[PDB]
Amino acid sequence: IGIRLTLPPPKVVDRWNEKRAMFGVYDNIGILGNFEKHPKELIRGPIWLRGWKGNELQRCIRKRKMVGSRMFADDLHNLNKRIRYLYKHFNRHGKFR
Amino acid sequence: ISRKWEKKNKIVYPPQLPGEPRRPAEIYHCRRQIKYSKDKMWYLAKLIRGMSIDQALAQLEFNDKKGAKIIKEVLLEAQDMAVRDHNVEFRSNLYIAESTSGRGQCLKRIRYHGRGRFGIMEKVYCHYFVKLVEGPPPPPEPPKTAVAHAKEYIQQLRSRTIVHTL
Amino acid sequence: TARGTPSRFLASVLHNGLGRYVQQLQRLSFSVSRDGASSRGAREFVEREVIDFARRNPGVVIYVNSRPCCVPRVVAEYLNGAVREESIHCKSVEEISTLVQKLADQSGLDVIRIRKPFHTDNPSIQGQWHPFTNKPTTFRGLRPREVQ
Amino acid sequence: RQWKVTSEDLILIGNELDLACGERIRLEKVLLVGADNFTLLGKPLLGKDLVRVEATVIEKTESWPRIIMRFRKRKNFKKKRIVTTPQTVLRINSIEIAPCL
Amino acid sequence: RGRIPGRQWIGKHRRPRFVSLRAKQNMIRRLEIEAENHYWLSMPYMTREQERGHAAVRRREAFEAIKAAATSKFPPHRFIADQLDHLNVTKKWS
Amino acid sequence: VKKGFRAAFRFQKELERQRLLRCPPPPVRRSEKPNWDYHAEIQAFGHRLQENFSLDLLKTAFVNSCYIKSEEAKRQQLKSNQELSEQGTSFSQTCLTQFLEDEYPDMPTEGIKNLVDFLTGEEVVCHVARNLAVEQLTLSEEFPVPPAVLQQTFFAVIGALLQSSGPERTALFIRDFLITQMTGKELFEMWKIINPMGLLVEELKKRNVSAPESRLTRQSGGTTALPLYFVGLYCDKKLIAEGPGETVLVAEEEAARVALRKLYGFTENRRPWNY
Amino acid sequence: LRNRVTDRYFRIQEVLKHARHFRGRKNRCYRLAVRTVIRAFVKCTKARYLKKKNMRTLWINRITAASQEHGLKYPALIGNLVKCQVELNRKVLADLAIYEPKTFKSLAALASRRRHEGFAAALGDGKEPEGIFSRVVQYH
RNA sequence: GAAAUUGAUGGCGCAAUAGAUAUAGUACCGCAAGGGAAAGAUGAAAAACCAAGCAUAAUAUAGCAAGGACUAACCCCUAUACCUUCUGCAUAAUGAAUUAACUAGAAAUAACUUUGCAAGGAGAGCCAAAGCUAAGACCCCCGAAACCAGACGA
RNA sequence: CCGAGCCUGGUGAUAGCUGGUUGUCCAAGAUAGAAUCUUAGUUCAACUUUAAAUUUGCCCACAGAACCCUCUAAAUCCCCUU
RNA sequence: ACUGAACUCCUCACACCCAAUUGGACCAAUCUAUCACCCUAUAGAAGAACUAAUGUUAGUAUAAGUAACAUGAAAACAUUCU
RNA sequence: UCUCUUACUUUUAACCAGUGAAAUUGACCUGCCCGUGAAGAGGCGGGCAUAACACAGCAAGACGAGAAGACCCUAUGGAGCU
Ligand SMILES: Nc1nc2c(ncn2[C@@H]2O[C@H](COP(=O)(O)OP(=O)(O)OP(=O)(O)O)[C@@H](O)[C@H]2O)c(=O)[nH]1
Ligand SMILES: [Mg+2]
Ligand SMILES: [Mg+2]
Ligand SMILES: [Mg+2]
Ligand SMILES: [Mg+2]
Ligand SMILES: [Mg+2]
Ligand SMILES: [Mg+2]
Ligand SMILES: [Mg+2]
Ligand SMILES: [Mg+2]
Ligand SMILES: [Mg+2]
Ligand SMILES: [Mg+2]
Ligand SMILES: [Mg+2]
Ligand SMILES: [Mg+2]
Ligand SMILES: [Mg+2]
Ligand SMILES: [Mg+2]
Ligand SMILES: [Mg+2]
Ligand SMILES: [Mg+2]
Ligand SMILES: [Mg+2]
Ligand SMILES: [Mg+2]
Ligand SMILES: [Mg+2]
Ligand SMILES: [Mg+2]
Ligand SMILES: [Mg+2]
Ligand SMILES: [Mg+2]
Ligand SMILES: [Mg+2]
Ligand SMILES: [Mg+2]
Ligand SMILES: [Mg+2]
Ligand SMILES: [Mg+2]
Ligand SMILES: [Mg+2]
Ligand SMILES: [Mg+2]
Ligand SMILES: [Mg+2]
Structure with a gap:
């Protein structure tokens, strides 16, 4: 009974809207623009993970380091607890050692 | 919830040809959310199942169960609507083709036990359904006689084949 | 399982081999698509094999309908009225050819358990065994312990 | 296998025979030929000049799906396979004998 | 009544087992086969000195083939045709 | 609600299948359903039977008088198969009599007549026509084709075969498709006697x-x-x-x-x- | 609930379809139907060996019945047919017994003939002429 | 676990057991601190077929309930539920009434595979005696009695 | 519900202990011991798996491997051929 | 003499019966990019799959219509009586 | 109290009417004897028995329900006290 009895409303996707049409443009800004701008500078998102990647523990550490002072009280407490738990898990648990 | 029993009275058949047997009238009636257990109602439904309207009313008038009065009221309403709307000529010329009790929407309550413990009561409700068919009640299925029983045995013997061979 | 599935006896549609063999398959409807990777094999089959198959099997009418389809299909209709629908979705040309040939060579009878690998309408030529075969007869048909 | 056969009989061989449907064949390994009043027995096979059994490849099919299930209790050992064995239905057109005794 | 203590066939007090004529005949048959085996092994064709080195060449060649198979293990070739054939997934009609 | 479309589509297909099973649609002649071409179907009929039918004669055999009457009524709002059916019935009766008499010279004339009647009867001829797809090509004013009309159409097809190929080929056709129907049958199963x-x-x-x-x-x-x-x-x-x-x-x-x-x-x- | 199963209905049905003909809740509840269906499929797989074994047992029983009707025992009939070099298998022998009683009587007579030829050879052990049916066709 | 030093515009999110606990810190529970829910679905206008459980329809000798079958449901023959745990379980060892939904493998080192470039690789830093760069691919869930801090309670 | 209250928080405490650990299919796969507040565990060996390089791996002919000890076993090791 | 396996032969086909562990080939559904357009394809991702944790929530069973529960009597329902 | 229990009243009880839980429950088409076996069988082997279902009792068994035994041991698990 976890199956709907009617077809869901048709999902129409405009493959040629502006976003999809111009997606990927300026990805080669560096190599095609005398390397004035690195492609990572085209990344819009959280300040602490612009042009950067890492596991959950590294991401949490970076977030606390970069915006920890601007975080809300309970959010920062949660981040500290998450960093503590991730440290314990990654440094004391796992199949391989 | 489902309410198909009520809709079953709204089906309109095409006009019958002159050289066609007269289609017996069928009247579907029901009562919803009766404060009565469906298990208890089933016994009354089985009792009146297959009987004529008058015989069912007679049995229900003298049965002591609470559901008997409700079923009698439902049957009387069914008879009235069959005569008024479904073009049934005679009141007495109706028999209970179908009679069943269905589970209703029940309410959950708490029953307090001896040591701070409890049980979950259920304020049980039941539905009741009837189909009234015009015409005399069908004759009861006669018990199969020794002759027919031996005939069936001999047919079983004759049906034997040489199994697992050409 | 056999107990959970219907079964039948080995049989032919109209004693198909006695007088002359008759190809039971009569209709093959190929629903294909102009576009769609699923029916690429169906398109190649229609291009390269369907004509040869049609001329090899003159008793089968083949209807190739190219319409927008996500699952290309082949519907085989047999003389006995049986209709078998198969999906040729994402099947290569060789797979489609083998499937079509199997449909052509297959009769319309249901593909269910066959109780016996054989079927004789005249199983006995010398007389089916009964208890009185291989039993000598006595004078005047006297049963045992009969006095006269 | 050994089949007891008669004219108009049907036989279900459990494999493809690499023969087009409706094609006529001669069954060469005939162990026994029998009539109402006499029977001829090979040692172990009767002669070609004695007996001629002819059939026709009526149908080529796949058997109904057979389930092959393997299970061992308390070992997480459960396996399922579906197999369809190719089959050919043949109709035995005639059984002819010649006076070669 | 008539219990065998513990488990049959293992304990100190096991269920008695008796050899049947069938088992005796089977063992005798196997013994006869092995006696014939003794006889047929008692007559070597060549002596040890005569056989010395008579198959050395063939054995060496067989091992050389094994070594060649072992040392020829090396990744298979890769083809532009194989890479480009994937473009056919979007092959359409007109 | 679970996001997705393919599971819902599969369940809709299953619901349609269950609805069809619970309320099966009335039977419809194969002509109405898609993937149908009468000329191709009739040519395939001839080739499948492995006989050089003349297409005009075969079409005339398949067309029935009742179909003509219905078509004329619809037009208000073609040569029938009567002669072909009569010729086919006569030839089939005579040829079956010849075969049966040759095979069973001791059989009485009454027995031969009863066997011929069984072989040309509505049940046997109807079964043969249905399993040979004569019904699909049959043009009638009602469906399913009644046994009488199906028998008439089958004998019209036989008559068309007689006119096209000849008596020998028609006799072979009869031997293949009607004489085979008495295989496994019993004398008095076919010829009821008292x-x-x-x-x-x-x-x-x-x-x-x-x-x-x-x-x-x-x-x-x-x-x-x-x-x-x-x-x-x-x-x-x-x-x-x-x-x-x-x-x-x-x-x-x-x-x-x-x-x-x-x-x-x-x-x-x-x-x-x-x- | 980023990713959720939407086919669970069909996954359950794939087993309930095989469980429909069971008794009790085993035909309705998947937790029970799956176990019962797995057991049924395992039994179906293991039942082919038993089918062949029981077919051979039935053929042997029927051949014994017919041989006893003709006064012979099954071992004697089978062994003497083999000695006669007639390679009819048990299935065909049972089919002949059921459907060709006269042919089976002929086969039993042949088996008894060969048995008596063997008895005569054993009794008059030596270089006496071989029995007519005892002679074995040689293939090269 | 440093420092000198260097230089710095939405969603491949959830869609009523999900997403905030939230329709609400409400109802309810506790003296108090405090804990803490559930759920709703018509239409443009209301001034218009599917889970379990049952019923239709109780039951016929025998037995993991099925399989081989069979003309035939049963009768015939074969068959000691599953999971976990264990040397070994039908075990009279654990769990499970059942349906629906939810519910549990996170990642470095070093290697392997596939590209790119090549005594150099990398979009400063780093590595390099064929290396370097990039990618792919391995590391779970629930459960204590406890310990400590601050509140709330006679 | 006081061997020391209750609530909140650290807290997803920790647990070598118990339980659970969800699609299909194929394949290889049960091996001595050492150390350990350690024998309910772990690390190293051994076994096992995968990939790669190379050439010998197993079986085994003579010859050969101790006196103590008067005698003193089934065997073993080594080992070209095959 | 015969019976007797999944041993072996026979016809056809073969990757298709070891726990822990390990290698591999596929893959349901979801979203994204392009396709496709009565249910899809090639790829990229991930809260990606439950016959089992005295699992959590909800529904309905079983126990079971069972254990249990209730209203002093007559009457004109004024009233009287115990 | 007992030898040595009996009689009666009320409650309970059973039947009719109304209302209506609980632990429990893998599925059950749920027999006895002997033997076997994870060392005490309704389910396995050999025997015997065997139409079908209700209602009321009984407590020999389902190693019956109940509380992840408080006895005992173990844990480089706790805590109280000296
Ligand atoms: N990433 C992100 N972009 C946002 C958000 N809210 C608004 N924006 C962006 O803000 C831009 C302007 O928003 P509008 O609402 O059109 O205009 P506006 O009210 O002048 O915008 P603001 O000055 O941002 O309040 C758009 O590009 C939005 O996508 C947010 O929460 N996240
Ligand atoms: Mg209280
Ligand atoms: Mg309840
Ligand atoms: Mg014992
Ligand atoms: Mg600094
Ligand atoms: Mg919520
Ligand atoms: Mg249901
Ligand atoms: Mg038990
Ligand atoms: Mg148990
Ligand atoms: Mg335990
Ligand atoms: Mg329990
Ligand atoms: Mg005070
Ligand atoms: Mg307290
Ligand atoms: Mg933990
Ligand atoms: Mg293996
Ligand atoms: Mg055997
Ligand atoms: Mg995909
Ligand atoms: Mg998940
Ligand atoms: Mg589930
Ligand atoms: Mg659970
Ligand atoms: Mg109840
Ligand atoms: Mg009770
Ligand atoms: Mg009571
Ligand atoms: Mg009551
Ligand atoms: Mg016992
Ligand atoms: Mg009782
Ligand atoms: Mg006890
Ligand atoms: Mg207990
Ligand atoms: Mg314990
Ligand atoms: Mg300690």
Whole structure:
């Protein structure tokens, strides 16, 4: 009974809207623009993970380091607890050692 | 919830040809959310199942169960609507083709036990359904006689084949 | 399982081999698509094999309908009225050819358990065994312990 | 296998025979030929000049799906396979004998 | 009544087992086969000195083939045709 | 709600299947349904039967008079198959009589006529037509095609074959598609008779044989509710046949049937038909 | 609930379809139907060996019945047919017994003939002429 | 676990057991601190077929309930539920009434595979005696009695 | 519900202990011991798996491997051929 | 003499019966990019799959219509009586 | 109290009417004897028995329900006290 009895409303996707049409443009800004701008500078998102990647523990550490002072009280407490738990898990648990 | 029993009275058949047997009238009636257990109602439904309207009313008038009065009221309403709307000529010329009790929407309550413990009561409700068919009640299925029983045995013997061979 | 599935006896549609063999398959409807990777094999089959198959099997009418389809299909209709629908979705040309040939060579009878690998309408030529075969007869048909 | 056969009989061989449907064949390994009043027995096979059994490849099919299930209790050992064995239905057109005794 | 203590066939007090004529005949048959085996092994064709080195060449060649198979293990070739054939997934009609 | 479309589509297909099973649609002639071309279908019919039908004759055979009347009525709001069906019926009857007489010279004219009637009857001809797809190509004003119309169309097809190929090919067609229908059938399964003892007495009188004497060859459980009686018919103290039964009368009747089969040469172990 | 199963209905049905003909809740509840269906499929797989074994047992029983009707025992009939070099298998022998009683009587007579030839050879052990049926056709 | 030093515009999110606990810190529970829910679905206008459980329809000798079958449901023959745990379980060892939904493998080192470039690789830093760069691919869930801090309670 | 209250928080405490650990299919796969507050565990060996390089791996002919000890076993090791 | 396996032969086909562990080939559904357009394809991702944790929530069973529960009597329902 | 229990009243009880839980429950088409076996069988082997279902009792068994035994041991698990 976890199956709907009617077809869901048709999902129409405009493959040629502006976003999809111009997606990927300026990805080669560096190599095609005398390397004035690195492609990572085209990344819009959280300040602490612009042009950067890492596991959950590294991401949490970076977030606390970069915006920890601007975080809300309970959010920062949660981040500290998450960093503590991730440290314990990654440094004391796992199949391989 | 489902309410198909009520809709079953709204089906309109095409006009019958002159050289066609007269289609017996069928009247579907029901009562919803009766404060009565469906298990208890089933016994009354089985009792009146297959009987004529008058015989069912007679049995229900003298049965002591609470559901008997409700079923009698439902049957009387069914008879009235069959005569008024479904073009049934005679009141007495109706028999209970179908009679069943269905589970209703029940309410959950708490029953307090001896040591701070409890049980979950259920304020049980039941539905009741009837189909009234015009015409005399069908004759009861006669018990199969020794002759027919031996005939069936001999047919079983004759049906034997040489199994697992050409 | 056999107990959970219907079964039948080995049989032919109209004693198909006695007088002359008759190809039971009569209709093959190929629903294909102009576009769609699923029916690429169906398109190649229609291009390269369907004509040869049609001329090899003159008793089968083949209807190739190219319409927008996500699952290309082949519907085989047999003389006995049986209709078998198969999906040729994402099947290569060789797979489609083998499937079509199997449909052509297959009769319309249901593909269910066959109780016996054989079927004789005249199983006995010398007389089916009964208890009185291989039993000598006595004078005047006297049963045992009969006095006269 | 050994089949007891008669004219108009049907036989279900459990494999493809690499023969087009409706094609006529001669069954060469005939162990026994029998009539109402006499029977001829090979040692172990009767002669070609004695007996001629002819059939026709009526149908080529796949058997109904057979389930092959393997299970061992308390070992997480459960396996399922579906197999369809190719089959050919043949109709035995005639059984002819010649006076070669 | 008539219990065998513990488990049959293992304990100190096991269920008695008796050899049947069938088992005796089977063992005798196997013994006869092995006696014939003794006889047929008692007559070597060549002596040890005569056989010395008579198959050395063939054995060496067989091992050389094994070594060649072992040392020829090396990744298979890769083809532009194989890479480009994937473009056919979007092959359409007109 | 679970996001997705393919599971919902599959469930819709299953619901449609269940709806169809619960309320199956009325049967519809194959012409109405898609993937149909009459010319291709009729050509495939001819090729499948492996006979050089003339297309005009075959179309005339398939078209029925009732279809013509219905078409004229619709037009208000073609040559029928009468002559072809008559020719086919006549030729089929004569050819079946020839085959049966050649195969069973001892069979009486009444038996031959009854066998021909069985082979050309509505049931057998209807079954053959349905399994040969004559019904699909049949043009009639109502569906499913009634057995009479189907039989008429089948014999019209036979007549068209006669006009196209010739008597020899038509006789081969009949042998293949109607003579095969009596394979596995019993003489009196095909030719219903009453008083087989009377028929046997008459036949033996014609053959100048003493009237048969019923005799109790064997019996078992005579006093039980499941007796067996093997009753033999003896002429001049010579056994001509014997039959089993539950009662003595039934055994005698079956022995008479066996004797009739032996006399007419249609025994179960008779020579199989030659194709 | 980023990713959720939407086919669970069909996954359950794939087993309930095989469980429909069971008794009790085993035909309705998947937790029970799956176990019962797995057991049924395992039994079906293991039942092919038993089918062949029981077919051979039935053929042997029927051949024994017919041989006893003709006064012979099954071992004697089978062994003497083999000695006669008639390679009819048990299935065909049972089919002949049921449907060709006269042919089976002929085969039993042949088996008894060969048995008596063997008895005569054993009794008059030596270089006496071989029995007519005892002679074996040689293939090269 | 440093420092000198260097230089710095929405969603491949959830869609009523999900997403905030939230329709609400409400109802309810506790003296208090405090804990803490559930759920709703018509239409443009209301001034218009599917889970379990049952019923239709109780039951026929025998037995993991099925399989081989069979003309035939049963009768015939074969068959000691599953999971976990264990040397070994039908075990009279654990769990499970059942349906629906939810519910549990996170990642470095070093290697392997596939590209790119090549005594150099990398979009400063780093590595390099064929290396370097990039990618792919391995590391679970629930459960204590406890310990400590601050509140709330006679 | 006081061997020391209750609530919140650290807290997803920790647990070598118990339980659970969800699609299909194929394949290889049960091996001595050492150390350990350690024998309910772990690390290293051994076994096992995968990939790669190379050439010998197993079986085994003579010859050969101790006196103590008067005698003193089934065998073993080594080992070209095959 | 015969019976007797999944041993072996026979006809056809073969990757298709070891726990822990390990290698591999596929893959349901979801979203994204392009396709496709009566249910899809090639790829990229991930809260990606439950006959089992005295699992959590909800529904309905079983126990079971069972254990249990209730209203002093008559009457004109004024009233009287115990 | 007992030898040595009996009689009666009320409650309970059973039947009719109304209302209506609980632990428990893998599925059950749920027999006895002997033997076997994870060392005490309704389910396995050999025997015997065997139409079908209700209602009321009984407590020999389902190693019956109940509380992840408080006895005992173990844990480099706790805590109280000296
Ligand atoms: N990433 C992100 N972009 C946002 C958000 N809210 C608004 N924006 C962006 O803000 C831009 C302007 O938003 P509008 O609402 O059109 O205009 P506006 O009210 O002048 O915008 P603001 O000055 O941002 O309040 C758009 O590009 C939005 O996508 C947010 O929460 N996240
Ligand atoms: Mg209280
Ligand atoms: Mg309840
Ligand atoms: Mg014991
Ligand atoms: Mg610094
Ligand atoms: Mg919520
Ligand atoms: Mg249901
Ligand atoms: Mg038990
Ligand atoms: Mg248990
Ligand atoms: Mg335990
Ligand atoms: Mg329990
Ligand atoms: Mg005070
Ligand atoms: Mg307290
Ligand atoms: Mg933990
Ligand atoms: Mg293996
Ligand atoms: Mg065998
Ligand atoms: Mg995909
Ligand atoms: Mg998940
Ligand atoms: Mg579930
Ligand atoms: Mg659970
Ligand atoms: Mg109840
Ligand atoms: Mg009770
Ligand atoms: Mg009570
Ligand atoms: Mg009551
Ligand atoms: Mg016991
Ligand atoms: Mg009782
Ligand atoms: Mg006890
Ligand atoms: Mg207990
Ligand atoms: Mg414990
Ligand atoms: Mg400690």
